[PDB]
Design a protein around this motif. Structure first.
Motif, PDB file in Angstrom:
ATOM      1  N   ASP B  16       6.847  16.186   6.241  1.00 31.02           N
ATOM      2  CA  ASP B  16       6.005  14.866   6.203  1.00 31.02           C
ATOM      3  C   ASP B  16       5.011  15.029   7.363  1.00 31.02           C
ATOM      4  O   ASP B  16       5.333  15.316   8.693  1.00 31.02           O
ATOM      5  CB  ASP B  16       6.975  13.475   6.440  1.00 31.02           C
ATOM      6  CG  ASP B  16       7.718  13.747   7.333  1.00 31.02           C
ATOM      7  OD1 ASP B  16       8.716  14.624   7.534  1.00 31.02           O
ATOM      8  OD2 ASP B  16       7.771  12.778   8.415  1.00 31.02           O
ATOM      9  N   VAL B  17       3.911  14.305   7.468  1.00 21.23           N
ATOM     10  CA  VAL B  17       2.804  14.462   8.558  1.00 21.23           C
ATOM     11  C   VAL B  17       2.595  12.996   8.980  1.00 21.23           C
ATOM     12  O   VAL B  17       2.474  12.211   8.121  1.00 21.23           O
ATOM     13  CB  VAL B  17       1.508  15.229   8.136  1.00 21.23           C
ATOM     14  CG1 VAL B  17       1.625  16.713   8.248  1.00 21.23           C
ATOM     15  CG2 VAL B  17       1.116  14.747   6.839  1.00 21.23           C
ATOM     16  N   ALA B  18       2.382  12.923  10.317  1.00 24.40           N
ATOM     17  CA  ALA B  18       2.249  11.247  10.678  1.00 24.40           C
ATOM     18  C   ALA B  18       1.346  10.790  10.207  1.00 24.40           C
ATOM     19  O   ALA B  18       0.287  11.072  10.078  1.00 24.40           O
ATOM     20  CB  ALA B  18       2.386  11.610  12.324  1.00 24.40           C
ATOM     21  N   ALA B  19       1.412   9.684   9.570  1.00 29.02           N
ATOM     22  CA  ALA B  19       0.227   8.666   9.088  1.00 29.02           C
ATOM     23  C   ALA B  19      -0.773   8.298  10.110  1.00 29.02           C
ATOM     24  O   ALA B  19      -0.430   7.965  11.401  1.00 29.02           O
ATOM     25  CB  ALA B  19       0.742   7.330   8.699  1.00 29.02           C
ATOM     26  N   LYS B  20      -1.967   8.532   9.791  1.00 28.23           N
ATOM     27  CA  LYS B  20      -3.156   8.366  10.773  1.00 28.23           C
ATOM     28  C   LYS B  20      -3.840   7.004  10.402  1.00 28.23           C
ATOM     29  O   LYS B  20      -3.875   6.695   9.303  1.00 28.23           O
ATOM     30  CB  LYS B  20      -3.908   9.717  10.494  1.00 28.23           C
ATOM     31  CG  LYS B  20      -5.219   9.619  11.725  1.00 28.23           C
ATOM     32  CD  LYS B  20      -4.684   9.583  13.103  1.00 28.23           C
ATOM     33  CE  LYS B  20      -5.746   9.678  14.126  1.00 28.23           C
ATOM     34  NZ  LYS B  20      -5.255   9.653  15.488  1.00 28.23           N
ATOM     35  N   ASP B  21      -4.611   6.668  11.531  1.00 31.81           N
ATOM     36  CA  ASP B  21      -5.247   5.371  11.312  1.00 31.81           C
ATOM     37  C   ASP B  21      -6.601   5.447  11.857  1.00 31.81           C
ATOM     38  O   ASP B  21      -6.860   6.426  12.846  1.00 31.81           O
ATOM     39  CB  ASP B  21      -4.531   4.160  11.931  1.00 31.81           C
ATOM     40  CG  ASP B  21      -4.891   3.989  13.491  1.00 31.81           C
ATOM     41  OD1 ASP B  21      -5.479   4.665  14.006  1.00 31.81           O
ATOM     42  OD2 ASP B  21      -3.638   3.106  13.720  1.00 31.81           O
ATOM     43  N   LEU B  22      -7.744   4.877  11.634  1.00 33.94           N
ATOM     44  CA  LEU B  22      -9.065   4.854  12.226  1.00 33.94           C
ATOM     45  C   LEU B  22      -9.148   3.764  13.002  1.00 33.94           C
ATOM     46  O   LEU B  22      -8.938   2.327  12.492  1.00 33.94           O
ATOM     47  CB  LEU B  22      -9.985   5.112  10.911  1.00 33.94           C
ATOM     48  CG  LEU B  22      -9.941   4.071   9.541  1.00 33.94           C
ATOM     49  CD1 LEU B  22     -10.361   2.868   9.828  1.00 33.94           C
ATOM     50  CD2 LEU B  22     -10.947   4.912   8.748  1.00 33.94           C
ATOM     51  N   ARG B  23      -9.704   3.742  14.112  1.00 35.38           N
ATOM     52  CA  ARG B  23     -10.090   2.833  15.029  1.00 35.38           C
ATOM     53  C   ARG B  23     -11.300   2.330  15.172  1.00 35.38           C
ATOM     54  O   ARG B  23     -12.325   3.363  14.605  1.00 35.38           O
ATOM     55  CB  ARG B  23      -9.088   3.114  16.534  1.00 35.38           C
ATOM     56  CG  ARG B  23      -9.811   4.121  17.104  1.00 35.38           C
ATOM     57  CD  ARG B  23      -8.763   4.771  18.256  1.00 35.38           C
ATOM     58  NE  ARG B  23      -9.382   5.803  18.915  1.00 35.38           N
ATOM     59  CZ  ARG B  23      -9.682   6.919  18.707  1.00 35.38           C
ATOM     60  NH1 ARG B  23      -9.705   7.433  17.445  1.00 35.38           N
ATOM     61  NH2 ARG B  23     -10.496   7.610  19.679  1.00 35.38           N
ATOM     62  N   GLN B  24     -11.937   1.402  16.050  1.00 33.92           N
ATOM     63  CA  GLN B  24     -13.311   1.141  16.279  1.00 33.92           C
ATOM     64  C   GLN B  24     -13.616   1.020  17.656  1.00 33.92           C
ATOM     65  O   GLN B  24     -13.182   0.118  18.471  1.00 33.92           O
ATOM     66  CB  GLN B  24     -13.699   0.080  15.319  1.00 33.92           C
ATOM     67  CG  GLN B  24     -15.076  -0.082  15.021  1.00 33.92           C
ATOM     68  CD  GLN B  24     -15.255  -1.370  14.055  1.00 33.92           C
ATOM     69  OE1 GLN B  24     -14.562  -1.852  13.542  1.00 33.92           O
ATOM     70  NE2 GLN B  24     -16.721  -1.457  13.845  1.00 33.92           N
ATOM     71  N   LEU B  25     -14.412   1.875  18.378  1.00 28.83           N
ATOM     72  CA  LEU B  25     -14.945   1.980  19.533  1.00 28.83           C
ATOM     73  C   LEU B  25     -16.150   0.989  19.674  1.00 28.83           C
ATOM     74  O   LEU B  25     -17.020   0.870  18.724  1.00 28.83           O
ATOM     75  CB  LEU B  25     -15.392   3.309  19.999  1.00 28.83           C
ATOM     76  CG  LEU B  25     -14.419   4.196  19.902  1.00 28.83           C
ATOM     77  CD1 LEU B  25     -14.855   5.548  20.513  1.00 28.83           C
ATOM     78  CD2 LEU B  25     -13.178   3.972  20.631  1.00 28.83           C
ATOM     79  N   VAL B  26     -16.073   0.189  20.965  1.00 33.45           N
ATOM     80  CA  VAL B  26     -17.221  -1.094  20.957  1.00 33.45           C
ATOM     81  C   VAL B  26     -18.317  -0.562  22.217  1.00 33.45           C
ATOM     82  O   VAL B  26     -17.700   0.010  23.096  1.00 33.45           O
ATOM     83  CB  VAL B  26     -16.720  -2.257  21.167  1.00 33.45           C
ATOM     84  CG1 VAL B  26     -17.759  -3.180  20.857  1.00 33.45           C
ATOM     85  CG2 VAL B  26     -15.527  -2.524  20.218  1.00 33.45           C
TER      86      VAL B  26
END
Lengths: 54, 53
Positions: B16-26
């Motif tokens: 299993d590979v760690a689930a990844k998320d997309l974040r937003q820079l301001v």
């Protein structure tokens, strides 16, 4: 004789009171009133009625 | 930017590979307030030298 109640012509009181009479000739005195007259109307708040000054 | 969007993969394995998320820079545009100190303009000085106040 042009009399005037000018303070410039009275110096002293009682015994020290002295009078001054000027025998001016033509053009003896010259008053060149400069056209530099200024004035202001400053109104103010913070009171029962508008406080205006001159 | 997703740092590890592309990763080494083992087809033979199946870990299993760690689930990844997309974040937003301001970004940011700071507002700067400027002004002028009280400049004294007495009409008397200009009038004394015959200048329009």
């Amino acid at each position: 004789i042009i009399i005037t109640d000018s303070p410039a012509l009275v110096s002293g009181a009682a015994e020290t009171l002295r009078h001054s009479t000027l025998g001016l000739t033509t053009g003896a005195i010259l008053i060149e009133q400069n056209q530099d007259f200024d004035s202001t109307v400053v109104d103010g708040t913070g009171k029962q009625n508008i406080t205006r000054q001159y | 930017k997703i740092q590890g969007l592309v990763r080494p993969r083992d087809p033979y394995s199946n870990a299993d590979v760690a689930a990844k998320d997309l974040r937003q820079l301001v970004d940011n545009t700071i507002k700067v307030a400027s002004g002028t100190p009280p400049i004294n303009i007495p009409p008397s000085m200009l009038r004394w030298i015959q200048k329009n106040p």
